[PDB]
């Protein structure tokens, strides 16, 4: 329920301007939210992680697959919270005076480094954690029995396991809002700026955790696309380029970006690929049943060395990208249209940036 103003004397409040009240109202939220979080994390630990562990149902790697570093973070917040409890005692009043230093301390500097690392490992595992729960539930009388019964503990608040796991990501996500409000009602110059920066570091934490998660499933996605690949139609006899090509193993690369594209390679021959821009090559598959096909029609190969790439804009179609590939043979153009401008603009940029990143590793 209750706002900050319910606790303060009528008379205390009447000594506060109506937006110092507001800042208080928020700071209060920052703090009481943190606690709620910490409560959920605990549910996860006590209601679930701990009772299944004990029960015997899951092995010790299945355990870790599901729960991963729920401890490290639980403790992280637990401590982040007593750090806040701290800040409340500081002031004799219930008007929490200046709170800036403390926000930089929790979110900037070596606090940043702690939260982002522990976060990223927790947050990124989720995909793989959820797969397990869903699976081991169809797969096990007792494991499903167990999750069901556990879900019926009112500590859960009638959230399910799958509904509780995504939360670490969730909190991280709110930190730069709360800070931005606090900062917004902070009358004092030198200390507003502190809060504004602490917010900034809760963003940088986010991108990190975001980029953690991208990498982590992009790994598992190449593992899968590589498995549902096809190179049978690959011409033993035409361009000795082509061992590198039959033997191409998506799985040895970092995948930077992907998605479906439409290859206009002719006004009477225009393909729709599914396209991987990997770390060092660009790959041009064709979806076909499940198998994605590595092929090369009238030759233009389906793989493009990013050391040769130059991008250009097609000044008629606003969704089309002139991918030149510069060689000693010729220079082979791959004019490619996207579904929405918004895509082309990123194909353009990720390609353009890889190109120069790669060429600047001489």
């Amino acid at each position: 329920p209750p706002n900050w103003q319910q606790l303060v004397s009528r008379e205390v409040l009447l000594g506060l301007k109506p937006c110092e009240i507001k800042r208080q109202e928020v700071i209060n939220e920052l703090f009481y939210t943190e606690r709620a979080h910490v409560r959920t994390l605990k549910v996860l630990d006590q209601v679930f992680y701990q009772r299944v562990s004990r029960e015997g149902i899951l092995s010790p790697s299945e355990l870790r697959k599901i729960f991963s570093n729920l401890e490290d973070i639980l403790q992280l917040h637990i401590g982040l919270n007593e750090q806040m409890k701290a800040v409340r005692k500081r002031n004799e009043t219930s008007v929490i005076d200046q709170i800036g230093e403390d926000l930089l301390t929790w979110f900037s500097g070596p606090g940043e480094e702690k939260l982002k690392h522990a976060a990223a490992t927790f947050c990124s595992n989720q995909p793989f954690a959820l797969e397990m729960i869903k699976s081991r539930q169809k797969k096990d009388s007792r494991f499903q029995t167990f999750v069901q019964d556990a879900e019926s503990n009112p500590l859960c608040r009638r959230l399910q396991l799958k509904d509780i796991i995504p939360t670490q990501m969730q909190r991280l996500t709110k930190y730069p809002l709360l800070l931005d409000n606090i900062a917004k009602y902070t009358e004092w110059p030198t200390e507003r700026e502190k809060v504004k920066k602490a917010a900034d570091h809760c963003r940088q934490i986010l991108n990190f955790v975001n980029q953690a998660v991208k990498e982590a499933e992009n790994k598992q996605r190449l593992e899968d696309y590589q498995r549902r690949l096809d190179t049978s139609s690959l011409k033993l006899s035409e361009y000795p380029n082509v061992e590198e090509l039959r033997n191409l193993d998506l799985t040895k690369r970092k995948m930077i970006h992907e998605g479906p594209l439409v290859w206009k390679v002719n006004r009477d021959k225009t393909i729709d690929l599914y396209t991987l821009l990997l770390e060092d090559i660009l790959v041009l598959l064709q979806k076909q049943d499940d198998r994605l096909v590595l092929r090369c029609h009238s030759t233009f190969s389906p793989v493009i060395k990013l050391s040769t790439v130059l991008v250009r804009q097609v000044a008629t179609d606003n969704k089309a990208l002139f991918v030149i590939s510069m060689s000693d043979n010729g220079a082979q153009i791959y004019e490619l249209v996207a579904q929405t401008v918004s895509e082309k603009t990123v194909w353009q940029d990720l390609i353009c940036r890889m190109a120069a990143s790669v060429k600047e590793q001489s």
Binding site: N3, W4, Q5, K22, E25, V26, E29, T33, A36, C123, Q126, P127, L130, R157, R158, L159, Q160, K162, D163, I164, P166, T167, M169, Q170, T173, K174, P176, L177, L178, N181, R203, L206, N207, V209, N210, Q211, V213, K214, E217, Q339, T340, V341, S342
Partner: protein, 180 residues
Amino acid sequence: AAIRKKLVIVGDGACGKTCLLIVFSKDQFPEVYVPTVFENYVADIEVDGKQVELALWDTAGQEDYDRLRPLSYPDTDVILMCFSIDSPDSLENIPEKWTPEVKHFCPNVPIILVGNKKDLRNDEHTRRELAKMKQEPVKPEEGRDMANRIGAFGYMECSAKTKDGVREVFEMATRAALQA
């Protein structure tokens, strides 16, 4: 047993998603303090005589973390896609940005377009800041034409600065969610 459904509310950032979930859930616009936060929360609701357990998921603050954001989506059962009636820039993000995503990550999940902030379609200020940019607030046709275009399940506007026609959004998402 009871019927759980998961409703997610996506849409541009700036157009009031959190609150609209607060207002729906507490069933009362908070006059005192609007929280910045709203937690995965299970709302009791009945529609069409069915008793539903709509589990409500905010996505506020996931706008800029394009590989985070998708963690919110899986197993969703209805989606409130929305846009600020005073921000026609938000309206055009709908077909550009959210529908593509939602139809990818949540495929055959019924959408519900929503003109939030309806109560500024007639504001003096609002008219006149947008009018600096040649723009003007979203006309209720525009809104419908979007929802039929984006293949939505229905359209719905509702007041930002209060409780207005906010129940009616959730009754409708709950109706959608109940279909398959």
